[model samples]
Every structure is written in C-alpha cells, then in structure tokens.
Target: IDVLRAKAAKERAERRLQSQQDDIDFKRAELALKRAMNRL
Candidate 1:
C-alpha cells in the first residue's frame, strides 16, 4: 500500500509538471508572434 501511494503521488507530480511545461511553451509561441507583429 505504501508503494502504491508513492507511485500515485509521483504520477500526480509528473502530470503537474507536464501541464506547466505546456503552458510555458504556449507563452513562448505567443511572445514570438507578438515580437514579429511589433516589428512590422
């Protein structure tokens, strides 16, 4: 039971990290687009 609980916790942390990383990537793309628009 302890091992299962630990595994569940790790999976949850990993999912959270993945979600945050995706958000960061999205913002990066947005920044690039804005920069290009400003230069025009």
Candidate 2:
C-alpha cells in the first residue's frame, strides 16, 4: 500500500510538475511526491 501511495503521489507530482514551472518545480514536485507518498 505504501508503495502504491508512493507511486500515486509520484504521478500527482509529475502532473503538478508539468502544470507548474518545470525547472524548479521538477525537484519540488518530486520531493512533494515523495513526501506525500511517505505520508500516505
């Protein structure tokens, strides 16, 4: 389940990354995704 959350958040963050500023948000997006995944 945790792995699923990790991937889920990853997918979300990737989408977020695409929507937001790609350059900086890319890193942030990944971090956000990982953090969210961890939370989930």
Candidate 3:
C-alpha cells in the first residue's frame, strides 16, 4: 500500500511538471510569433 501511494504521488508530480512546462513553451512561442508579426 505504501509503495502504491508513493507511485501515485510521483505520477501526479510528473503530470503537474509537464503541464507547467507546456504552458511555458506555449507562452514562449506566442511571444516570438507576436514579435515577428509586429516587426512586419
């Protein structure tokens, strides 16, 4: 039971981390796109 709990916790942490990373990547892309469009 303890092992299962630990595994579940790790999976939750990984999911949160991945989501945060994806948000950052999306924002970075948006900033670059806007900058290019405004420059045009």
Candidate 4:
C-alpha cells in the first residue's frame, strides 16, 4: 500500500512539472512568433 501511494505521488508531481515546462516552451514560441509577425 505504501509503495503504491508513493508511486502515485511521484507520478503526479512529475506530470505537473512536465506541464509547467510545456507551458514555458509554448509561451516562448508564441512570443517569438508575435515578434516576427510584427516585424513583417
């Protein structure tokens, strides 16, 4: 029971971290595109 609970917590934390990274990447790309389009 303890092992299963620990695994679930680890997985949940990892998922949250992954999502945060994804958001950062998306925001960076969006900023770049906006700048490029404005320059055009």
Best by lDDT: 1
**Native-referenced Cα lDDT, model 4:** 0.83
- Tens digits of lDDT, candidate 2, 1-40: 8987788888897877675556775687579757866678
Per-prediction backbone clash count: 0, 0, 0, 0
Quantify all predictions' global Cα lDDT against the true fold. 0.84, 0.74, 0.83, 0.83
**Per-model TM-score on C-alpha atoms:** 0.42, 0.39, 0.42, 0.42
lDDT of the structure predicted as candidate 2: 0.74
TM-score of 4: 0.42
Regions of candidate 3 where Cα sits further than 4 Å from its true position: 20-40
Error of 2 at 25 (Å): 20
Candidate numbers sorted by lDDT from highest down: 1, 3, 4, 2
RMSD (Å) per prediction: 4.8, 15.1, 4.6, 4.4
List model 3 lDDT by residue over 1-40, tens digit each: 8988899999888888897668977897789767876678
lDDT digits (tens) for residues 1-40 of candidate 1: 8988899999888887897668977897889867876778
Question: In model 1, which range of ten residues has the least summed lDDT?
Answer: 30-39
Backbone clash total for model 3 is 0
Q: What does the lDDT read for residue 7 in candidate 2?
A: 85
Residues 1-40 of candidate 4 have per-residue lDDT tens digits of 9988899999888888887668977887789767876678
